[PDB]
């Protein structure tokens, strides 16, 4: 897969059904089994969006990417203290460039 791969960046994504990553780095994932991932995080100081390639047989941020076969990145909330944490994964080109909350 080709994925957005900006790692963690500041984001203005908030209060809307979907957001573009605004990441200008598209990479070919190193291994064929890797999928695209996005992580949206809001704490009391800022909002960030993380975009990477990742092998779904390996945990990421201590979670398994259960949705890796999906073609779209549908954000789901994870239990994390101190912040609001949403993650999605997907296996179509640049699919982590469009993160969907609805």
Curated annotation (Swiss-Prot):
Disulfide bonds join 3-36, 6-23, 13-19, 29-53, 73-88, 90-95. Glycans are attached at residues 22, 46. Residues 2-102 are extracellular. Belongs to the protein kinase superfamily. TKL Ser/Thr protein kinase family. TGFB receptor subfamily. Homodimer. Heterohexamer; TGFB1, TGFB2 and TGFB3 homodimeric ligands assemble a functional receptor composed of two TGFBR1 and TGFBR2 heterodimers to form a ligand-receptor heterohexamer. The respective affinity of TGFRB1 and TGFRB2 for the ligands may modulate the kinetics of assembly of the receptor and may explain the different biological activities of TGFB1, TGFB2 and TGFB3. Component of a complex composed of TSC22D1 (via N-terminus), TGFBR1 and TGFBR2; the interaction between TSC22D1 and TGFBR1 is inhibited by SMAD7 and promoted by TGFB1. Interacts with DAXX. Interacts with DYNLT4. It is linked to Hereditary non-polyposis colorectal cancer 6: An autosomal dominant disease associated with marked increase in cancer susceptibility. It is characterized by a familial predisposition to early-onset colorectal carcinoma (CRC) and extra-colonic tumors of the gastrointestinal, urological and female reproductive tracts. HNPCC is reported to be the most common form of inherited colorectal cancer in the Western world. Clinically, HNPCC is often divided into two subgroups. This is TGF-beta receptor type-2. It comes from Homo sapiens. The gene is TGFBR2. The chain holds residues 50 to 150 of 567 of the full protein.
């Amino acid at each position: 897969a080709l994925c957005k791969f900006c790692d963690v960046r500041f984001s203005t994504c908030d209060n809307q059904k979907s957001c573009m990553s605004n990441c200008s780095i598209t990479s070919i994932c190193e291994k064929p089994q890797e999928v695209c991932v996005a992580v949206w995080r809001k704490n009391d100081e800022n909002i960030t969006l993380e975009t990477v390639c990742h092998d779904p047989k390996l945990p990421y941020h201590d979670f398994i990417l259960e949705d890796a076969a999906s073609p779209t990145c549908i954000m789901k909330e994870k239990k994390k203290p101190g912040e609001t944490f949403f993650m999605c994964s997907c296996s179509s080109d640049e699919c982590n460039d469009n993160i969907i909350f609805s």
